[PDB]
Amino acid sequence: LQPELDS
Amino acid sequence: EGVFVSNGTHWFVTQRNFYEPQIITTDNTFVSGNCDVVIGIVNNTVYDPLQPELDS
Amino acid sequence: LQIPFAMQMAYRFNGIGVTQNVLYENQKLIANQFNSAIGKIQDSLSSTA
Ligand SMILES: *[C@@H]1O[C@H](CO)[C@@H](O[C@@H]2O[C@H](CO)[C@@H](O)[C@H](O)[C@H]2NC(C)=O)[C@H](O)[C@H]1NC(C)=O
Ligand SMILES: *[C@@H]1O[C@H](CO)[C@@H](O[C@@H]2O[C@H](CO)[C@@H](O)[C@H](O)[C@H]2NC(C)=O)[C@H](O)[C@H]1NC(C)=O
Numbered sequence: 001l002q003p004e005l006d007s
Numbered sequence: 008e009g010v011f012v013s014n015g016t017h018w019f020v021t022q023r024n025f026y027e028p029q030i031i032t033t034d035n036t037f038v039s040g041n042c043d044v045v046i047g048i049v050n051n052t053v054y055d056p057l058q059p060e061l062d063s
Numbered sequence: 064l065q066i067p068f069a070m071q072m073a074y075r076f077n078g079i080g081v082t083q084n085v086l087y088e089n090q091k092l093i094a095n096q097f098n099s100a101i102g103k104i105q106d107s108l109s110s111t112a
């Protein structure tokens with residue numbers, strides 16, 4: 001989930 | 008995992024054969040139906056890991 | 064260890080690979096099938112030695 005944390 | 012239990016103040020999930028309570032979450036529980044159908048159902052929170060992190 | 068009987072059957076359903084909510088959503092119907100099948104055994108045994 002960490003690489004998705006742009007938002 | 009196993010079984011819902013309460014110590015009289017808090018609800019936990021635990022494994023069936025060795026008492027080891029954990030908090031109730033979207034990850035150790037799954038949904039079916041709605042609250043009207045089940046016999047002997049009770050009310051509690053179920054914690055979500057995701058939202059409080061994705062808020063920041 | 065004491066355990067409520069509608070919980071014991073939910074674990075026995077889980078043991079045959081049927082998801083335990085399949086019991087709770089149908090508990091009264093399941094109990095009526097069990098009670099009816101018990102009834103048929105009295106009749107069956109009463110019919111012939
Ligand atoms: C039921 O279990 C919970 C968690 O172990 C207990 O809640 C804690 O209670 C102590 C005081 O006794 C507090 O200092 C903690 O902050 C509480 N933790 C939480 C997460 O609320 C509760 O006391 C237990 N109840 C009984 C009757 O044993
Ligand atoms: C669980 O929580 C719900 C509300 O989230 C409770 O439902 C209400 O209960 C009262 C009294 O039975 C009814 O008048 C309301 O119409 C109910 N509202 C809804 C939306 O159904 C429920 O009683 C709680 N159950 C327990 C065992 O605490």
Ligand SMILES: *[C@@H]1O[C@H](CO)[C@@H](O)[C@H](O)[C@H]1NC(C)=O
Pocket residue numbers: 046047
């Ligand atoms: C358990 O029995 C009590 C009466 O002793 C009754 O009030 C209660 O509703 C029953 N609960 C369940 C889940 O069967």
